[PDB]
Design an enzyme around this catalytic site. Structure first.
Site: not given
Ligand SMILES: [Zn+2]
Ligand SMILES: [Zn+2]
Length: 201
Positions: A93-94, A97, A103
């Protein structure tokens, strides 16, 4: 919620990295596993940093948002990792980014897809639900993805475990779509990342 800003897309998909101190060998192996997961599904590549000016740094730090989205440029950018928040899916997830995703629930079109249940947001945590401005995101023709690794769970930042802050507005393939998985990139995350990085079709 793919960034619209071309300068935030890492050149050639190449993302140099440093792994900071204070991690165990198992934690370091998970960072590499998460980077390999992105590499096997997309044309992004992670390179051990030498002298590149811009790079990511897996940094022992308290858990909590936010990793810079896309390439900051002009120096290092930290991904904060600690005991609360070091598992494979969290790291993937990171790295979403880092690649250039905000998101999912912050897409400018999100109101057609989810309800934000304001009654249930923890006081002082409302900012986490703000949409990106339309000039900041270009979804590349991709539909809102409930299965995204970038999608919040149903009760993220809620007042109560059983009080939803995000509610999908419709069914997908005959079921209420589950949200908030942190196990692997979704088909939609992969399809969209490949468009963002102009990976050959
Ligand atoms: Zn996040
Ligand atoms: Zn998406």
């Amino acid at each position: 919620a793919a960034t619209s800003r071309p300068e935030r897309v890492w050149p050639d998909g190449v993302i140099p990295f440093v792994i900071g101190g204070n991690f165990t060998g198992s934690q370091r192996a998970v960072f590499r596993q998460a980077m390999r997961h992105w590499e096997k599904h997309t044309c992004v590549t992670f390179l051990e940093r030498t002298d590149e000016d811009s790079y990511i740094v897996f940094t022992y730090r308290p858990c909590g948002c936010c990793s810079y989205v896309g390439r900051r440029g002009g120096g290092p950018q930290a991904i904060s990792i600690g005991k609360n928040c070091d598992k494979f899916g969290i790291v993937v997830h990171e790295l979403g980014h880092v690649v250039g995703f905000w998101h999912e629930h912050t897409r400018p079109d999100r109101d057609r897809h989810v309800s934000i249940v304001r009654e249930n947001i923890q006081p002082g945590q409302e900012y986490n639900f703000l949409k990106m401005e339309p000039q900041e995101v270009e979804s590349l023709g991709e539909t809102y993805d409930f299965d995204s690794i970038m999608h919040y769970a149903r009760n993220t930042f809620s007042r109560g475990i059983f009080l939803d802050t995000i509610v999908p507005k419709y069914e997908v393939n005959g079921v209420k779509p589950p949200i908030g998985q942190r196990t692997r990139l979704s088909k939609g995350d992969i399809a969209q990342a490949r468009k963002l990085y102009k990976c050959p079709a």
